[PDB]
Design a protein around this ligand. Structure first.
Ligand SMILES: Nc1ncnc2c1ncn2[C@@H]1O[C@H](COP(=O)(O)OP(=O)(O)OP(=O)(O)O)[C@@H](O)[C@H]1O
Ligand SMILES: Nc1ncnc2c1ncn2[C@@H]1O[C@H](COP(=O)(O)OP(=O)(O)OP(=O)(O)O)[C@@H](O)[C@H]1O
Ligand SMILES: CC(C)CCC[C@@H](C)[C@H]1CC[C@H]2[C@@H]3CC=C4C[C@@H](O)CC[C@]4(C)[C@H]3CC[C@]12C
Ligand SMILES: [Mg+2]
Ligand SMILES: [Mg+2]
Length: 1181
């Protein structure tokens, strides 16, 4: 890592921006190197900005009665804010005095021998010094203001991420990820570039006051008469401003809902492909856009007028100003043009520099209010008493989830009531019960996530927690198992052999460390559970909580890991466990059987028995045909007004001129009549509400069509290409990159087209009427194009490293919020905060570099304009004839046009920066694609089958072949990580395979893939429940009636489950269905499969954490409903083997098929010895 070149920098280097020069030379003729990126300055690192404002916010919370975040921001930024402001004021004031000096210098060309001839050369020296000081004075302050804005945003982001780790479990249901993603995604680039504009609130009025006097000097009465129009117009813009921020708060609710649905479906697409929910998910996301784009169009129409009140304003401000003076006194053409020159600055001042400033103050304070509101929320309180006898005691505890019923405490039943137990140190509790007893809830009360209404808890602060839903952070298996602490060879090895991952870890190529993705979908269910258990075991504490880690494990692994870890590695400490088997309750010492949130029994086991680039700019215009018709329509009207103005100026110039109306002489006429046109060519060549409206309308329609294709392509792309990319990378584009095509990109293109047409049409009319001005413009034209092409080589490459630099920030914010309970259990906030700071530093490193490279370009293009204007002014003034200097008449006219072009080139750079977004969208659109009555009996014939995830990697299954006769139930089994899911995924052909599986005498290649996947009926291992009503989850296509779904709901047994909630089959599930328990989610997938009547169906461990009572429902529904259809049942519990006839065993990357159970168990002795005594009397009579 190379240090920043800004650190070792001379005043001249920091003033002229010469320190950014290397990366341009490096980036021009080579692709950018990671080495070449510079480390951030020590001033704007994450930790200092966090520390600094964290310190002020605590002081703000301590002192005042009702604290405000702006007051905290004031005390650490205000002086450096206002310090640049006064330079930016003086830099803007020097624009207003430019017409005074240049005015006379134009006037000194007049043969009428005025006093100007005398003063011209001193104006000549002065006006050069005037430009030089402004170019120096402006740009350092803008970069200064951008640099302060970047520090403000990094400071606040750091405070949100600290706040979200201390946030309550009560609040997590209210705030989804879409709330947090949107808040960061809105501010990420808008807040930094805004603080340049923010000062013009108090610059613009003083500028208006300063300009109004200089005009008052020329026109005594009428200038006020003119100003009134701009007061009239400024109120109209403020009206549009308020209107446009009422359309943005309606839409802001909608965007959050779209991101949570988009995140959820892509996070677990493998299930979405199995069920065949492409049509369903696309139509759902389609309906959320409808409302969004309606509000986007309405907001965009009000935004156009706001950005179209400067171009039109021009003609009318001068006309109403000169007309009254003309009627009484008369006017000289010298006077009209000086007024023009003042007017342009005044509008700039009052119609794009005043409405852009206020609008920035609303958004910044609005964003700060949301952050301040977010910082003042209900916190997770901690109350740990290190003093103890290591006595985990609980007495008289009741607990409600929601606030209302708990606070009012007969609204509903509390999940716990009248519980009490005593636990000495060196003994395990067996927490037993049916699905929805409150076993997870009990552990949540022990940790302190769920707060009890009446009762008391006390243990020491040190605690470990193995959750029911396993959580894998991004990184290596080592980084997962140790989890933000030092490494211990003796400890770590002894844990992995106890948990027995030595088998599973040795099969990987990179033995110890393989980089797992967000969630760890590279691993199977069994491998995640044991990693979560290894993380729990490797951690050292007084109390170990274990929320049923033996759900996805087979009986052999389950017994060995129980008799190898729970009773061996830790057997001198309190360790409450969740389980439902006799073998575990025998060795256990204290047993607690919960039922309907009530203690059915409490005691011991013995007692219980006793008891009972060109291509990017071209593929974005040829998505939608309307856009190319509108642009041609604009151009033909543009040609007409260019044509209209030309014959106006033909008649005007060719005039043969009592007529006080307007004084002209042969001399003055020739070199003022043209300049008056150039200053009034901003309105004449303006886009109206006939051209500008449809252009904005179509550009939003392009972003509607692009998003449809993008979401469409991501859904039906193959599995390898979706495992390759991250969660935050997907979520970054649909959040930020699609929001740029809707909001900023439509109106930036309008200003680039508007300014480009003005310059083209200005040069066109001036050139055709007077030839040499085209030749005079050409050397300045080539200078801008030359420098632009040179800059974009570096700029496009920085804008991609920075844009893709955002994915680290989001990816980390997902896992942080996803596995929040484990973070506070272990107490690893200091790790994740410092790990989050690295993401901000990475983004800052790239963003700061891009930002600094831009002002180089912004300064150089102004310097080029200054260098030429200096040359033009002395050539003009020195080569002035004794009468009628024509050299300056030709040259300065060009240099008046180049001011408008300079502004257009700056707009052109803003378009290209926003157009990369569309570039990165098109990468996702251009991804590869996975690509009588038919399933009558459902007999399958496999031959020469092979299964692997990566292309040309390791074969998981090799030369598999077997046969199932029609309407026969088949058992599937093996050791955890055998490949059982891979065999189920091979039928759906989600991963790439070779061979053929022919069904009912017909093969794969004979039919399409989607028509193929509708034959099967799937219950996947990982459950997927998106945000919506129960009826939406049970059938998205809404084929089945309520009578139908209620008819299914009784057999699988969600009768008592649904009726608990207020809206029966209308209750909106949130946070991926956190309201339901783990058992009900298995029943949810069961009902989902029962509805889908399929003559073949595949069950990937239907019973995961179901007790023997709940499992009767599975076999009841499996015997009754699934009558004639063939069943492949992948299950670990041996009770399920009584149902099905044929068995498929998986080992050594190959299969074995068996008819009877006796033969199969006979050859494997350790697996036969693992069978429970209660399940041993069933198999063998
Ligand atoms: N966040 C929540 N909000 C509202 N109700 C909840 C929430 N979490 C759990 N419940 C309800 O509390 C009851 C008990 O929940 P809990 O998850 O502790 O049961 P469990 O014994 O862990 O289930 P399983 O045996 O299937 O793992 C369930 O009926 C469930 O609907
Ligand atoms: N998407 C994937 N990419 C790469 N390798 C994978 C992927 N999924 C699984 N594997 C590897 O293949 C092995 C077996 O796959 P599979 O997921 O079918 O096991 P499983 O039978 O589902 O496990 P369990 O018995 O715990 O349910 C895993 O141990 C894992 O290392
Ligand atoms: C400091 C600012 C806010 C003061 C108000 C604006 C400035 C531009 C105003 C205030 C006083 C004004 C001056 C008042 C009187 C005269 C004399 C007149 O024959 C020429 C113009 C001139 C010289 C004015 C120029 C503009 C002026 C300097
Ligand atoms: Mg549970
Ligand atoms: Mg499996």
């Amino acid at each position: 890592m190379q240090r920043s070149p800004l650190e070792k920098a001379s005043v001249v280097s920091k003033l002229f921006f010469s320190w950014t020069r290397p990366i341009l030379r490096k980036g021009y003729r080579q692709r950018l190197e990671l080495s070449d990126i510079y480390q951030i300055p020590s001033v704007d690192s994450a930790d200092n900005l966090s520390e600094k404002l964290e310190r002020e916010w605590d002081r703000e919370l301590a002192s005042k009665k009702n604290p405000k975040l702006i007051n905290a921001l004031r005390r650490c930024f205000f002086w450096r804010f206002m310090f640049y402001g006064i330079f930016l004021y003086l830099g803007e004031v020097t624009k207003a005095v430019q017409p005074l000096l240049l005015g006379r210098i134009i006037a000194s060309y007049d043969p009428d021998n005025k006093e100007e001839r005398s003063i011209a050369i001193y104006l000549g020296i002065g006006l050069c010094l005037l430009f030089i000081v402004r170019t120096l004075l402006l740009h350092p302050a803008i970069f200064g203001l951008h640099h302060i804005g970047m520090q403000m945003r990094i400071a606040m982001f750091s405070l949100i991420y600290k706040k979200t780790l201390k946030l309550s479990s009560r609040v997590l249901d209210k705030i989804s990820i879409g709330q947090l993603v949107s808040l960061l995604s809105n501010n990420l680039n808008k807040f930094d570039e805004g603080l340049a504009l923010a000062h013009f609130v108090w610059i613009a009025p003083l500028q208006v006051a300063l300009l109004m006097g200089l005009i008052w000097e020329l026109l005594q009465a009428s200038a006020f008469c003119g100003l009134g129009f701009l007061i009239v117009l400024a109120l109209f813009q403020a009206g549009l401003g308020r209107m446009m921020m009422k359309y943005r708060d309606q839409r802001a609710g909608k965007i959050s809902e779209r991101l949570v649905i988009t995140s959820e479906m892509i996070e677990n697409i493998q299930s979405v492909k199995a069920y065949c929910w492409e049509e369903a998910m696309e139509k759902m996301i389609e309906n959320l856009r409808q409302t969004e784009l309606k509000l986007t169009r309405k907001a965009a129409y009000v935004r156009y007028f706001n950005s179209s009140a400067f171009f039109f304003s021009g003609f009318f401000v001068v006309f109403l100003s000169v007309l009254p003076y003309a009627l009484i006194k008369g006017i000289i053409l010298r006077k009209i043009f000086t007024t023009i020159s003042f007017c342009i600055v005044l509008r700039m001042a009052v119609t794009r520099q005043f409405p852009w400033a206020v609008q920035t103050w609303y958004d910044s304070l609005g964003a700060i209010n949301k952050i301040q509101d977010f910082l003042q929320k209900q916190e997770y309180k901690t109350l740990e008493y290190n003093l103890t006898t290591t006595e985990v005691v609980m007495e008289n505890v009741t607990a409600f989830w929601e606030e209302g019923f708990g606070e009012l405490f007969l609204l509903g039943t509390p999940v716990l009531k009248d519980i009490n137990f005593k636990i000495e140190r060196g003994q395990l509790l067996a927490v037993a019960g049916s699905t929805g007893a409150g076993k997870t809830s009990l552990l949540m009360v022990i940790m302190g996530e769920l707060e009890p209404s009446e009762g008391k808890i006390k243990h020491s602060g040190r605690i470990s927690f193995c959750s029911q839903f396993s959580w894998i952070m991004p990184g290596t298996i080592k980084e997962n198992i140790i989890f933000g602490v030092s490494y211990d060879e003796y400890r770590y090895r002894s844990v992995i052999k106890a948990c027995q991952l030595e088998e599973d870890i040795s099969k990987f190529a990179e033995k110890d460390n393989i980089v797992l993705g967000e969630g760890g979908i590279t691993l199977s269910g069994g491998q995640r559970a044991r990693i979560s258990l290894a993380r729990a075991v490797y951690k050292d504490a007084d109390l170990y909580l274990l929320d049923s880690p033996f759900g996805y494990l087979d009986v052999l692994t389950e017994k060995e890991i129980f008799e190898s870890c729970v009773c061996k590695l830790m057997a001198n400490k309190t360790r409450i466990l969740v389980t439902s088997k006799m073998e575990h309750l025998k060795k256990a010492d204290k047993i607690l059987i919960l039922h309907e949130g009530s203690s059915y029994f409490y005691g011991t086991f013995s007692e219980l028995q006793n008891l009972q680039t060109w291509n990017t700019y071209l593929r974005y215009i040829t998505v939608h045909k309307s856009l190319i018709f509108v642009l041609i329509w604009c151009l033909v009207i543009f040609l007409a007004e260019v044509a209209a103005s030309l014959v106006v100026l033909w008649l005007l110039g060719n005039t043969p001129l009592n007529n006080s109306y307007a004084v002209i002489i042969t001399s003055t006429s020739s070199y003022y009549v043209f300049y008056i046109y150039v200053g009034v060519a901003d309105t004449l060549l303006a886009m109206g509400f006939f051209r500008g409206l449809p252009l904005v309308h179509t550009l939003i329609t392009v972003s509607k069509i692009l998003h449809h294709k993008m979401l469409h392509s991501v859904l039906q792309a193959p599995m390898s290409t979706l495992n390759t990319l991250k969660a935050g990378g997907i979520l970054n584009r649909f959040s930020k990159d699609i929001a740029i095509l809707d909001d900023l990109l439509p109106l930036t293109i309008f200003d680039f087209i508007q300014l480009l047409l003005i310059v083209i049409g200005a040069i066109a009319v001036v050139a055709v009427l007077q030839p040499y001005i085209f030749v005079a413009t050409v050397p300045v034209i080539v200078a801008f194009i030359m420098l632009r092409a040179y800059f974009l080589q570096t700029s496009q490459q920085l804008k991609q490293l920075e844009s893709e630099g955002r994915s680290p920030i989001f990816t980390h914010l997902v896992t942080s919020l996803k596995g929040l309970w484990t973070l506070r259990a272990f107490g690893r906030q200091p790790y994740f905060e410092t790990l989050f700071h690295k993401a901000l530093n990475l983004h800052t490193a790239n963003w700061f570099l891009y930002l600094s490279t831009l002002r180089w370009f912004q300064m150089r293009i102004e310097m080029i304009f200054v260098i030429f204007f200096i040359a033009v002014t002395f050539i003009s003034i020195l080569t002035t004839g004794e009468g009628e200097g024509r050299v300056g008449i030709i040259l300065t006219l060009a240099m008046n046009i180049m001011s408008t072009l300079q502004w257009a080139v700056n707009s052109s750079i803003d378009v290209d920066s926003l157009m990369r977004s569309v570039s990165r969208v098109f990468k996702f659109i251009d991804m590869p694609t996975e690509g009588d009555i038919w399933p009558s009996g459902g007999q399958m014939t496999v031959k020469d089958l092979t299964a692997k995830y990566t292309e040309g990697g390791n074969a998981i299954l090799e030369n598999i072949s077997f046969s199932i006769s029609p309407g026969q139930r088949v058992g599937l089994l093996g050791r955890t990580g055998s490949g059982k899911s891979t065999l189920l995924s091979a039928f759906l052909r989600l991963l790439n395979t070779e061979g053929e599986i022919q069904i009912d005498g017909v093969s794969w290649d004979s039919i399409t893939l989607q028509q193929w996947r509708k034959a099967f009926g799937v219950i996947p291992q990982k459950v997927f429940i998106f945000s919506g009503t129960f009826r939406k989850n049970l059938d998205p296509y809404e084929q089945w009636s309520d009578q139908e779904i209620w008819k299914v709901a009784d057999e699988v047994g969600l009768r008592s489950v649904i009726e608990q909630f207020p809206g029966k089959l209308d209750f909106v599930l949130v946070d991926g269905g956190c309201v339901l328990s783990h058992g009900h989610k298995q029943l949810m997938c069961l009902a989902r499969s029962v509805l889908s009547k399929a003559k073949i169906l595949l069950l990937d461990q239907p019973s995961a954490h179901l007790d023997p009572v709940t499992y009767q429902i599975i076999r009841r529904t499996l015997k009754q409903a699934f009558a004639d259809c063939t069943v492949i049942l992948c299950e670990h519990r041996i009770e399920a083997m009584l149902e099905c006839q044929q068995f498929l065993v998986i080992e050594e990357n190959k299969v074995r098929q068996y008819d009877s159970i006796q033969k199969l168990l006979n050859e494997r002795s350790l697996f036969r010895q693992a069978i429970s005594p209660s399940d041993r009397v069933k198999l063998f009579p």
